[PDB]
Design a protein around this ligand. Structure first.
Ligand code: ADP
Ligand code: MG
Length: 713
């Protein structure tokens, strides 16, 4: 029996709306009309349901839950959909398209653990914050080759749609999985990968593809206050296919790894999972060879007050990371070198610099220095001198510096951050060498980049993330609205342009523009100006955009911050240390020291130009901002060669709790993601177009005859 029609199947139980009872039936056939209203107009996102009792030509009168009658203009009314629409799988079918109506549909579904809902062309996924048995091989098999309209909403169905369009249209595809921290991006990304591996698999290559994310998560994920498994890097995964539709390989591109987490963590947060995994999972032999101890013995792990995650066994995770490495193809020697680098970083963090005779730092206790030098295979006396007494050129003269405690400690942190970043780049390169071994015919790209963020402190790293999200929103806007209307106006179907009110260009230009120069261009200019400070930088920004740019704000409450109005709201950025972050400096004597390592992996991190080198940009190296703008432009160009599909992950609350869908939290995300605007284009427009020579020309309202095609709703 077909599980799609079997009321006893797990498909029906977990993916379909439960059969309503005779009491619900009686309510459903009622001719009564209702309105969604705010009992307190100071709380716009808090709604109640009121019955319409009377009407005039331009108004409705309704009874409140309290009993009192209120009047609302028909133009201002948010009518409640007939209850037969409650739980509808595609919200473009709703009679009334409004904020409480959309929220209420999502709520009815969520109360039944139905996390997936369509909003016209795209998928909405509300995080359940609990396990739902809808990702089995049995579920995969049900979704295989079914049309979107034939099955319930699911991450598997949007993945199958992308796969079929790739075969039928001979076009590359993309699945853009977006949302704020902890919304569910990474979980849904993994479901896309699992699905494609199964429906397009032949498998050794498929198993290795499935083992790529567990390796990268051990090194790129950490417990933050918003997510126990927060991704601290963005990723673009290309699943590669041959002409026949079989997976021929995969490619991974990583973005914005949060390197400062290695040296500093906020209270309750953790460093990268790998540090805890190695300390809990190492064999007694490994612990002796790498000079390991408990996380409380390392400065890089004993500052937050948190060394474990509830329900996570770090030693068991370590076995999973090690098995993922074995499957992918990392040798035991390469794995041991990877663990020596992690061990070495922890030892480097324990180096305590002290003031010596007069100005200049000394190292009184060499235990941590020697432990780091042993695992790294470097000379400890050369390491010591490179940290406290690095040599530089003053003109053409060779001068030994003598760094004080603060500068010595900052140089040591720069080395740690360089080691970790370079190791992460190396892991991605090693994974790609295995998974990308054929020339692809087509691809399905899965994008999982860091979500839009408004933290208490927003710095350069938050600007790069929010800028990326701003580019993605514009891409969504262009594909959903602009390009769609441009097709209607070119085909001459007598279309009246709709201003959807979404425009990210001014914010994008404010950040990455060249003429007039944007934030990044001004930061790069200041980064090469010898006398630049945090003060000259903020003054330069204020001079260029204050009272000149509608998206920019010079705050009255601070002298070191500026505001940017993003699609997802205003963000105040602090500029402290942006010059140093943009230069990302590392003392050349440290590079020389590590280039001379006895370790084969450490050597690659300092000698492979594609990992170690910084692009040549004349007088000075390329800045981090210029490098990132370029890497992002390249991502956008790849995305523009694809047919895109959007998955909007919605966090239900800010407490990481299941069964607690919060009005204010969800409605704020729906407004940012353009969910209502997205449903309006699907309803008001002509989503499907087929030519007469693609099936007198009419051969027969809800259609439009165009110049070269017939449009239908
Ligand atoms: N579909 C889902 N099913 C079960 N748990 C989920 C699901 N999506 C998210 N979660 C839970 O929420 C957490 C955060 O999800 P995640 O994908 O890591 O978010 P993001 O990448 O958006 O920051 C997960 O670790 C898991 O506990
Ligand atoms: Mg994630």
């Amino acid at each position: 029996m077909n599980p799609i029609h079997d009321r006893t199947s797990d498909y029906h139980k977990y993916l379909k709306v439960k059969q309503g009872d005779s009491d619900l039936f009686k309510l459903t056939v009622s001719d009564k009309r209702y309105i969604w209203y705010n009992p307190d107009p100071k709380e716009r996102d808090s709604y109640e349901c009121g019955e319409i009792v009377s009407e005039t030509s331009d108004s409705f009168t309704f009874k409140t839950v309290d009993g009192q009658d209120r009047q609302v203009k028909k133009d201002d009314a948010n009518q409640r959909n007939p209850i037969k629409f409650d739980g509808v799988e595609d919200m473009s079918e709703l009679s009334y398209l409004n904020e409480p109506a959309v929220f209420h549909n999502l709520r009815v579904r969520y109360n039944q653990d139905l996390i997936y809902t369509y909003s016209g062309l795209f998928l909405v996924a509300v995080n359940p914050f609990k396990r739902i048995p809808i990702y089995t091989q049995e579920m995969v098999d049900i979704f295989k080759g079914r049309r979107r309209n034939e099955v319930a909403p699911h991450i598997f169905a949007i993945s199958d749609v992308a796969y079929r369009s790739m075969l039928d249209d001979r076009q590359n595809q993309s699945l853009l999985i977006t949302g704020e921290s902890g919304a569910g991006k990474t979980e849904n990304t993994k479901k896309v990968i699992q699905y494609l591996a199964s429906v397009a698999g032949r498998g050794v290559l498929e198993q290795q593809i499935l083992q790529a994310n567990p390796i990268l998560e051990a090194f790129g994920n950490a417990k933050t206050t918003r997510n126990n498994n927060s991704s601290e890097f963005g990723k673009f995964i290309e699943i590669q296919f041959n002409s026949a539709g079989f997976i021929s390989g995969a490619s991974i591109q990583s973005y914005l790894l949060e390197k400062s987490r290695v040296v500093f963590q906020s209270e309750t947060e953790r460093n990268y999972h790998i540090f805890y995994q190695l300390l809990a999972g190492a064999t007694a032999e490994e612990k002796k060879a790498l000079h390991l101890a408990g996380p409380e013995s390392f400065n890089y792990l004993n500052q937050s007050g948190c060394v474990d995650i509830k329900g996570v066994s770090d030693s068991e995770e370590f076995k999973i990371t090690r098995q993922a490495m074995d499957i992918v193809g990392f040798s035991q020697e390469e794995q041991m070198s990877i663990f020596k680098i992690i061990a070495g970083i922890l030892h480097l963090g324990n180096i305590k610099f002290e003031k010596g005779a007069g100005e200049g730092a000394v190292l009184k206790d060499k235990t941590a220095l020697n432990a780091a030098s042993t695992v790294f295979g470097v000379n400890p006396s050369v390491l010591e001198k490179a940290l406290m007494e690095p040599r530089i050129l003053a003109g053409r003269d060779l001068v030994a510096q003598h760094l004080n405690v603060e500068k010595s400690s900052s140089s040591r942190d720069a080395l740690v951050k360089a080691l970790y970043g370079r190791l992460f780049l190396w892991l991605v390169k090693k994974i790609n060498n295995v998974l990308c071994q054929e020339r692809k015919a087509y691809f399905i790209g899965v994008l999982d980049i860091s979500g839009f963020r408004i933290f208490k402190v927003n710095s350069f790293e938050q600007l790069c993330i929010n800028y990326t999200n701003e580019k993605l929103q514009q891409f969504f806007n262009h594909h959903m609205f602009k390009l769609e209307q441009e097709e209607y106006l070119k085909e001459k179907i007598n279309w009246t342009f709709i201003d959807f009110g979404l425009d990210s260009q001014a914010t994008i230009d404010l950040i990455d523009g060249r003429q007039p120069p944007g934030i990044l261009a001004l930061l790069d200019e200041q980064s090469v100006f010898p006398n630049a400070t945090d003060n000259t930088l903020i003054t330069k920004l204020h001079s260029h955009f204050s009272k000149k740019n509608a998206k920019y704000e010079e705050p009255r409450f601070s002298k070191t911050e500026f505001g940017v109005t993003h699609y997802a709201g205003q963000v105040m950025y602090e500029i402290q240390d942006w010059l140093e972050k943009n230069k990302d400096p590392l003392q050349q004597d440290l590079e020389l020291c590590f280039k001379d390592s006895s370790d084969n992996v450490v050597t690659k991190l300092f000698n492979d130009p594609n990992i170690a080198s910084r692009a040549k940009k004349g007088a000075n190296f390329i800045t981090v901002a210029a490098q990132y703008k370029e890497q992002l432009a390249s991502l956008m160009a790849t995305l523009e060669t694809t047919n895109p599909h959007f998955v909007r992950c919605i966090i239900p609350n800010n407490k990481q709790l299941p069964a607690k869908l919060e009005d204010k939290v969800v409605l704020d995300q729906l407004r940012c993601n353009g969910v209502l605007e997205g449903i309006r284009i699907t309803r008001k427009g002509f989503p499907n177009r087929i030519i007469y020579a693609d099936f007198a020309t009419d051969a027969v309202e809800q259609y439009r005859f165009g110049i070269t095609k017939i449009f239908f709703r």
